[PDB]
Amino acid sequence: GPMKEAKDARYTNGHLFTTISVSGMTMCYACNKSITAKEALICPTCNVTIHNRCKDTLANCTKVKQKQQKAALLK
Ligand SMILES: [Zn+2]
Ligand SMILES: [Zn+2]
């Protein structure tokens, strides 16, 4: 395919952080406070939200969904 430029290089600790458009009540899963930004990041596998710069303190993407999955025996 013509997509000979796959920028598959956006993994800090296993989570895929994609740019979102925070326009409402949002909280930084890395700074435990309200994201007053117009852009944030989300892991499609652990459903976190961060200030689009606090991803270098988020745990491995199998140590985030171990707190962000309300359908697991997390006890
Ligand atoms: Zn933050
Ligand atoms: Zn994740």
Taking the C-alpha atoms of residue 72 and residue 51, their distance in angstroms, rounded to an integer, is 27
Task: Say if 2 falls within a structural domain.
Answer: no
Total domain count for the chain? 1
Taking the C-alpha atoms of residue 50 and residue 32, their distance in angstroms, rounded to an integer, is 9
Phi, psi of 42 (to 5 degrees): -135, 140
As a dihedral over the C-alpha atoms of residue 5, residue 59, residue 72, residue 70, rounded to 10 degrees, the angle is -90
Are 9 and 29 in contact by the 8 Å Cβ rule? The answer is no
- Distance (angstroms) between ligand 2 centre and the Cα of 34 equals 20
What residues make up the domain containing 54? 11-69
Tell me the ligand closest to 37's alpha carbon.
Answer: 1
- Distance (angstroms) between ligand 2 centre and the Cα of 21 equals 18
Give me the sheet containing 49-50, strands edge to edge.
18-20, 40-42, 49-50
CATH number of the structural domain spanning residue 44: 3.30.60.20
Task: Say if 75 falls within a structural domain.
Answer: no
- Distance (angstroms) between ligand 1 centre and the Cα of 4 equals 34
Nearest CA among 38, 35, 16 for reference residue 25? 35
3-class SS letters over the chain: CCCCCCCCCCECCCCECEEECCCCCCECCCCCCECCCCCEEECCCCCCEECCCCCCCCCCCCCCHHHHCCCCCCC
Taking the C-alpha atoms of residue 49 and residue 34, their distance in angstroms, rounded to an integer, is 10
- Distance (angstroms) between ligand 1 centre and the Cα of 39 equals 12
